[PDB]
Scaffold this motif. Sequence first.
Motif, PDB file in Angstrom:
ATOM      1  N   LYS A 199      34.520  38.537  37.240  1.00 53.10           N
ATOM      2  CA  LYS A 199      35.419  37.639  37.953  1.00 53.10           C
ATOM      3  C   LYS A 199      36.082  36.690  36.955  1.00 53.10           C
ATOM      4  CE  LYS A 199      31.673  36.818  39.787  1.00 53.10           C
ATOM      5  NZ  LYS A 199      30.486  36.215  40.455  1.00 53.10           N
TER       6      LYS A 199
ATOM      7  N   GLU B 196      36.584  37.257  33.728  1.00 53.66           N
ATOM      8  CA  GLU B 196      37.501  37.964  32.842  1.00 53.66           C
ATOM      9  C   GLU B 196      38.911  37.964  33.413  1.00 53.66           C
ATOM     10  OE1 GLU B 196      35.665  41.794  32.538  1.00 53.66           O
ATOM     11  OE2 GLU B 196      34.790  41.407  30.562  1.00 53.66           O
ATOM     12  N   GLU B 197      39.032  38.192  34.714  1.00 46.67           N
ATOM     13  CA  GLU B 197      40.344  38.200  35.342  1.00 46.67           C
ATOM     14  C   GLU B 197      40.985  36.819  35.258  1.00 46.67           C
ATOM     15  OE1 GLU B 197      39.227  39.907  39.176  1.00 46.67           O
ATOM     16  OE2 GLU B 197      40.529  41.621  38.748  1.00 46.67           O
TER      17      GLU B 197
END
Lengths: 79, 60, 74, 49
Positions: free
Chosen positions: A75, A77-78
């Motif tokens: 989550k 990383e996005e």
Amino acid sequence: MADRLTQLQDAVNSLADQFCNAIGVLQQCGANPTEEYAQLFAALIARTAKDIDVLIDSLPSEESTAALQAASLYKLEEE
Amino acid sequence: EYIDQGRNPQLYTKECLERALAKNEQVKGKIDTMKKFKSLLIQELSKVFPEDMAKYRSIR
Amino acid sequence: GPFYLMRELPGSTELTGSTNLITHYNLEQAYNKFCDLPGMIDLPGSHDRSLIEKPPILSSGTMLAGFRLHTGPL
Amino acid sequence: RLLALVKWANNAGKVEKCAMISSFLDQQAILFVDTADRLASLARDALVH
């Protein structure tokens, strides 16, 4: 290094090394000296035992493990 | 070599008895010192875990 | 409940080094006696190659013999 | 010398008892130190690994 693992490991090693020599030392040297040493040694060993008990509570529980951390990272990383 | 110098063996037996008694006394001393050290370490840390001491006293 | 790897301790007082080994081994009265025999030997004789006898001991025709050797009286 | 030998011949018990008692302690003495050495050896090497 301010690491929980390092402190716990260090305490165990001191107890192992400290108590192996001490029992041998008691056998090695024989009124006043034997009695005081008994208390001095018992004191340290007792102190170490208390320290070990204190250390275990600090560590994290079964929940929020490594897999969960990886999932959290996803989550992130996005973002 | 004790006969070579020339002396009755009674003195040698006395010396053997006294050295064996000295060894027995120092063994008794080390035994009682480790026993009292065990007792003092047991009674010194009786409060760390009462159930462990209770089980230790029961099993003995 | 039980601790890991508890076992049975040995028989309460078997043979140790904490007993009085001499009194158990029936040697008490000899010690209570004990606590020169050359002199003891000396009483029987006079005094007490003594260099030669020791060396011999370190490694470790009676009638005919008398007839064979004659020693002058004077 | 023979008389001293035959007088000590019956007095060979107490010396043997003292000798075996001393050996027992000596034999035991190697054992306590060995156990201590093993404990010392373990702390030095086993703990490090």
